[PDB]
Amino acid sequence: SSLPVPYKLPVSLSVGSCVIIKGTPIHSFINDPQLQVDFYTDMDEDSDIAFHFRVHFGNHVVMNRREFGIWMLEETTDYVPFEDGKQFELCIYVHYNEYEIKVNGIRIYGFVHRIPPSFVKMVQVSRDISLTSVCVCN
């Protein structure tokens, strides 16, 4: 992996920002690998999370947020167009009222903001992936 995992990237996000994550699952899908991305409000891992995104490859994606240290109501979708054993491109676009999640060009979900995205100070990419690159663009 070009980058250690868990990767904790200090960030500053605004409407118009795009988080671009490239990597490869380190296991085949029959072994149930996962990929997790957290939009943290601080470098500390117990800080609140504006947006938690956990993919179970070949299966489904689970999304939540953690406010005042409390996990809120979980959201999911079954649309996980990641392909087994290959590099993916995952972009997260900060729109005015949601995070738009794109997987290899495909929009899968819009996670609606419950706190302003400008409170996000760190993005952590974690679990069963080899990380090729992460970019934050505007």
Curated annotation (Swiss-Prot):
GO BP: apoptotic process; phospholipid metabolic process
User: In which tissues does this protein get expressed?
Assistant: Detected in adult and fetal spleen, fetal kidney, adult urinary bladder and placenta. Placental expression originates predominantly from the syncytiotrophoblast.
InterPro entries cross-referenced by the UniProt entry: ConA-like_dom_sf, Galectin-like, Galectin_CRD
Q: What is the effect of changing C137S?
A: Loss of homodimerization
Where found, per UniProt? Cytoplasm; Nucleus matrix
What Pfam families does this protein map onto? Answer: Gal-bind_lectin
Q: What is any one of the record's Gene Ontology cellular component terms?
A: cytoplasm
* GO MF annotations, alphabetized: carbohydrate binding; lysophospholipase activity
Q: Where is the Galectin domain?
A: 5-137
* SMART domains named in the record: Gal-bind_lectin (SM00908), GLECT (SM00276)
- Keywords recorded for this protein, A-Z: Apoptosis, Cytoplasm, Disulfide bond, Hemagglutinin, Lectin, Nucleus
* Highest rank taxon of the organism: Eukaryota
Q: How does it assemble?
A: Homodimer; disulfide-linked.
Q: Report the function annotation for this chain.
A: Binds beta-galactoside and lactose. Strong inducer of T-cell apoptosis. Has hemagglutinating activity towards chicken erythrocytes.
Question: What is the name listed in the Swiss-Prot or TrEMBL entry for this protein?
Answer: Galactoside-binding soluble lectin 13
Q: Which gene encodes it?
A: LGALS13
